[PDB]
Amino acid sequence: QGHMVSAEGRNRKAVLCQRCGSRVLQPGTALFSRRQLFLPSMRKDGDLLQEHWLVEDMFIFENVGFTKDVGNIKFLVCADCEIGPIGWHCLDDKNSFYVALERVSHE
């Protein structure tokens, strides 16, 4: 919204950890997505979120952590401070990784 999504639907801004500023994604590396996904709280239960960056290969991420499998899901966390979930991946869909905008910052 604003100078956030390009005409092609890509992220205009870098995506950062809100807590430590680790760079998760470079600009232009992801597509805006309104798919509804459940993300457990980053503390202490969670939110149904529907604004995400959709990334098509794990190696497009600049810096990110993956949790061990929880069923066929892996959650994404900050590589540096490990706060998360900031994102979500279903292993059955090899080319779809979601970073929730509410859970990150943009520079």
Partner: protein
């Protein structure tokens, strides 16, 4: 592509924020990006430092690893002998083509493991050794990555 190389790395050997949920599940691996000579290097890193294994180690544990970083705490005698056990196990189960590096680590303790001992261990197994001053674990990964990059470049042409 958004990078020039992908290296798979293993971080082994014993030695503050908080996310409980994440503490409960545990980290599988991390992806990090660095630059070396203006090339973009993607690192996929599994770190089992501070982690004792219960499970018996197989070839499946080291398959695909391109570099292994071996860490011990210079203040700890157990942690140093623990790296000697690891070096033994790697030589048996990991590819003989894997790059390896030993790191003598560690603010706040008496040094219990000498630098000569660390240097002599690397010599006995024919691999590099760093004691991490302005020189730390990050510099070590850059060096390990440098070494994998050089080897890799020749192979391609």
């Amino acid at each position: 592509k958004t990078y020039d190389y992908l290296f798979k790395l293993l971080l082994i050997g014993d030695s503050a924020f908080n996310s409980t949920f994440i503490s409960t599940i545990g980290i599988d691996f991390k992806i990090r990006t660095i630059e070396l000579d203006g090339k973009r290097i993607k690192l996929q890193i599994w770190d089992t430092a501070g982690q004792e294994r219960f499970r018996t180690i197989t070839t499946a544990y080291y398959r695909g690893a391109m570099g292994i970083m071996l860490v011990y705490d210079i203040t700890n005698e157990k942690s140093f002998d623990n790296i000697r056990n690891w070096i033994r196990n790697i030589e048996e189960h990991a590819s003989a083509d894997v790059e390896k590096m030993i790191l003598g680590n560690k603010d706040v303790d008496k040094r219990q493991v000498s630098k000569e001992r660390g240097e002599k261990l690397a010599l006995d197994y024919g691999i590099k050794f760093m004691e991490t001053a302005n020189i730390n674990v990050e510099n070590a990964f850059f060096t390990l990555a440098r070494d994998i990059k050089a080897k890799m470049d020749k192979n391609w042409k």
